[PDB]
Design a protein around this ligand. Structure first.
Ligand SMILES: *Cc1c(COP(=O)(O)O)cnc(C)c1O
Ligand SMILES: *Cc1c(COP(=O)(O)O)cnc(C)c1O
Lengths: 424, 422
């Protein structure tokens, strides 16, 4: 065991954090329950709201009794078995649910252990698909700027070149095709231009890959769902697969079960993750259509050569089943609409603040965009004083709260955001 | 769902590893070294001779691991590792730093082995960029290797005999030395050095599996090669990366296979047995020098950060698994396992279809003169109360460390009968 001081000491010497350095200070978390984290501030444990849902994951809050129970129930019977030559109930139950609730036509599921991996699996499916059609020249990807798809090297290649620091990786990453930043408001001219650019690359392109409706890590930007309708149409006419990365948008977050639903379109391949397990454990999945699966499987190449060791882990699958069932068993649509309303009401006053350039809400996502970078040394202690854990990045103050947050809690979260923006 | 229903859903909707779409056996329980599987409508108990792909070193449902998991679950399932830290991450980092080859002082947690390999590569590239030598961006390895299924990991898989052979045209083009031989031959090392010499200015790192190459063909090599690799890399200023995702945590008879050579790499990857086979977790360790050079470079930071980085549940069960291993005389245990495998597999050498029998720690291998047909091997093993998963021309086992001598004997007996049927 360790005290918070010893935790800090070990951490400082030995632990890498996300996109950070060694030797160039994290706060100790000692507990988490419901929408609340218990953190150590100046030696004292304080409870603060998890306004980020621990990076989109904790949709039902932490330690939800239904999810805890599902995990302990599975733990008593079978922790894990290899998915090579064996199958099990949690995998089957989850696959059936996912095929049932995702956009029409996605009826095969490949489980993996993280979002980045599921994106690489998606790309491999796309590339292998065209090889299966005797068109191995179709091996590039196309996306629009502003996106994020994970940190592995292939995933990096489709991340926004700036957000992704591609300047530090020149000569290393695959060279992919980038369309301009998709605008917020629908402009048919944008889709016409996208089509024209894609058309000249069509014989070289395996797939278009995008985050539908909301671009998360790349800048919390929203775009009209009609663009997705356009992409589906362009992809169909030029024979390029469409891949939706719903790793952040999945499971109700944008006000629809999957953001694709806002557009009423179905991609050829889809990735889900983050909230899949209700934020308990790492699990991801890549779904594809019957046509994709068979075309791969009928290829001379044959099998899809991917197989994570912990593929379809019974514990992760079991909690995900429970997380998904819990979401489906409640009036989730009304819950998100309410959250969206609370965020809109709460954030409204920031729009008139001097440093604020935009205020936007989409389902259970609220964003204040400022006219300059947000100083974390100022923002964090402010938010903590107000009982809220916020993680601004760049010029963005934002939140994606647990679905279980009460009106009072949403008011607390937004009040802390508005204050952070005021201090900007 | 009943077993028949599971099979129905699975055939319709589930993609399995390394396979096409369009039958698996239903597993319904796991306890200790035993799986309960359903065969012809009836539950049967079979030994998990594969430790569930090399993960379940303490067996399934071990009370110490189960309780570590439920204890952590009561307190905190997960928080984002951005701006926060926690006891499970710190306890595990401290353990890993203490038990791995000397000099490995920093720990980057990720969710899978393939990711940890990409993290290792990113460390190496960023390191040289930090030194002002961005031309050092290629990797070198020897043939016969396997490092995962993500695109960077694939680039260092064996390019002809390896599982990723069909992708070679789209992968980064790396530098390959010939297959490392089993017995030590100074001429092999000299040739490796001569090859590396000509690429030194473009090489970020040498990356290899130490002592045992797993998925590439369960081949063993003399630890002395690792000593030469360390020497060569030091002299030519190329980083040395060991992928111990398969070999770690006692599997080869030493705590880490590098220990057989007394060598420390600059960067090291671990996974699989890290969590005792409960949950997915991996880690990439590097020296203080590598970390600082990255941190002081133009980037100012290592540009990677998985959503579930340092997951408290996975870290907590890993802590318990490592402590359980260290808290017993694991070396004697593995030596006893190895003796049992050796004695049990000895009669396979005489069989007509068997080309080699070899054992290294708790790994036992019968190499056959043809690819093993699973449709024949699987039922033959199940009839003998053992779950075996051959691949290529290999019938092999990596049993849980908790297997008794009788259980090892049952495992090796089934392997021999499988080899007899080939
Ligand atoms: C977070 C994210 C990923 C990467 O998921 P990891 O589990 O961190 O590898 C990929 N795509 C999107 C849209 C994401 O938000
Ligand atoms: C299994 C393995 C990996 C990859 O582990 P995954 O969890 O399947 O990504 C990498 N390297 C070696 C040596 C391995 O044995």
């Amino acid at each position: 065991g360790l005290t918070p001081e010893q935790i800090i000491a070990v951490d400082g010497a030995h632990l890498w954090h996300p996109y950070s350095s060694i030797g160039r200070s994290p706060v100790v978390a000692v507990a988490a329950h419901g929408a609340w984290l218990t953190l150590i501030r100046d030696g004292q444990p304080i409870e603060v709201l998890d306004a980020m849902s621990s990076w989109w994951t904790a949709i039902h809050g932490h330690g939800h009794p239904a999810l805890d129970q599902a995990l302990t129930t599975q733990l008593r019977v079978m922790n894990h078995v290899m998915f090579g030559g064996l199958t099990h109930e949690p995998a089957a139950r989850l696959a059936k649910l996912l095929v049932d609730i995702t956009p029409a036509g996605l009826d095969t599921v490949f489980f993996s252990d993280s979002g980045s991996v599921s994106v690489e699996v998606a790309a491999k499916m796309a590339l292998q698909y065209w090889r299966g059609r005797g068109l191995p020249g179709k091996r590039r990807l196309m996306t629009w700027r502003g996106g994020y798809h994970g940190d592995t090297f292939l995933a990096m290649s489709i991340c926004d070149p700036h957000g992704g620091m591609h300047s530090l990786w020149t000569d290393v990453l695959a060279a992919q095709v980038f369309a301009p930043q998709v605008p917020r408001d629908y402009d048919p001219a944008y889709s016409a231009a996208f089509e024209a650019q894609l058309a000249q690359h069509a014989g070289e392109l395996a797939a278009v890959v995008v985050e539908p409706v909301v671009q998360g890590a790349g800048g919390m930007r929203f775009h009209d769902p009609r663009y997705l309708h356009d992409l589906r149409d362009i992809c169909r006419r030029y024979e390029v697969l469409l891949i939706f990365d719903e790793i952040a948008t999945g499971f109700g977050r944008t006000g629809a079960l999957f953001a694709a639903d806002h557009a009423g379109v179905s991609p050829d391949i889809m990735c889900v993750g983050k909230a899949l397990t209700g934020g308990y454990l790492s699990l991801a999945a890549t779904l594809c259509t019957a046509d994709v699966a068979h075309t791969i499987s009928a290829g001379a190449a044959g099998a899809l050569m991917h197989g994570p060791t912990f593929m379809a882990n019974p514990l992760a699958c079991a909690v995900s089943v429970a997380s998904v069932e819990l979401l489906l068993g409640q009036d989730w649509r009304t819950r998100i609409t309410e959250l969206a309303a609370g965020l809109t009401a709460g954030l409204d006053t920031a729009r008139a603040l001097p440093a604020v350039t935009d205020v936007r809400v989409c389902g259970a996502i609220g964003v204040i965009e400022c006219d300059r970078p947000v100083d974390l040394a100022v923002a964090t202690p402010a938010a903590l004083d107000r009982g809220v854990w916020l993680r601004p990045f760049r010029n963005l103050v934002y939140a994606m709260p647990p679905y279980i947050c009460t009106p009072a809690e949403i008011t607390q979260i937004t009040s802390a955001m508005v204050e952070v923006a005021r201090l900007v």
